[PDB]
C-alpha cells in the first residue's frame, strides 16, 4: 500500500519524535527525522525515520504550516479523550 495506519499507544510518558516539513517548506507533509528510544513512538515498533505523516487521528496535515502540524501532534499526545494517536504514514517520499 501507499499509506499505512499506525496506532501509537501512549505506553510511555513521552511521544519521542522529531519532525521537519509542512506547507511552508519543500517537504509539504511533515516527515519524521528522529525517533527517541524509550518514547511511545519507538515503543510501538512501527514508526520509522523518514515516514511522512499524511494524517493524525483522521485529520489531514496537507496545507498546515510546520508549527500548526506540530501543534496537532502535541495536542493528540496530551489529550485525555483517547490513550493513543493514529498516524497515517507513507514510506514514499512526498514532494508536492
Amino acid at each position: 500500500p501507499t499509506s499505512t495506519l499506525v496506532r501509537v499507544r501512549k505506553s510511555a510518558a513521552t511521544l519521542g519524535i522529531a519532525i521537519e516539513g509542512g506547507a511552508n517548506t519543500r517537504q509539504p507533509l511533515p516527515r519524521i527525522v528522529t525517533i527517541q528510544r524509550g518514547g511511545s513512538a519507538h515503543n510501538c515498533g512501527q514508526l520509522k525515520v523518514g515516514h511522512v505523516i499524511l494524517e493524525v487521528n483522521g485529520q489531514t496535515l496537507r496545507g498546515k504550516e510546520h508549527k500548526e502540524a506540530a501543534r496537532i501532534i502535541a495536542e493528540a499526545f496530551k489529550t485525555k479523550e483517547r490513550d493513543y494517536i493514529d498516524f497515517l504514514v507513507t514510506e514514499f517520499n512526498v514532494m508536492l
Binding site: 519532525i19 517537504q27 527525522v33 508549527k67
Partner: peptide, 13 residues
C-alpha cells in the same frame, strides 16, 4: 536524514 534545508524548522515532540 533531513530533506528540508537549515532555515526550515525542526520540532521535538
Amino acid at each position: 536524514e533531513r530533506l528540508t534545508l537549515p532555515p526550515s524548522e525542526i520540532t521535538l515532540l
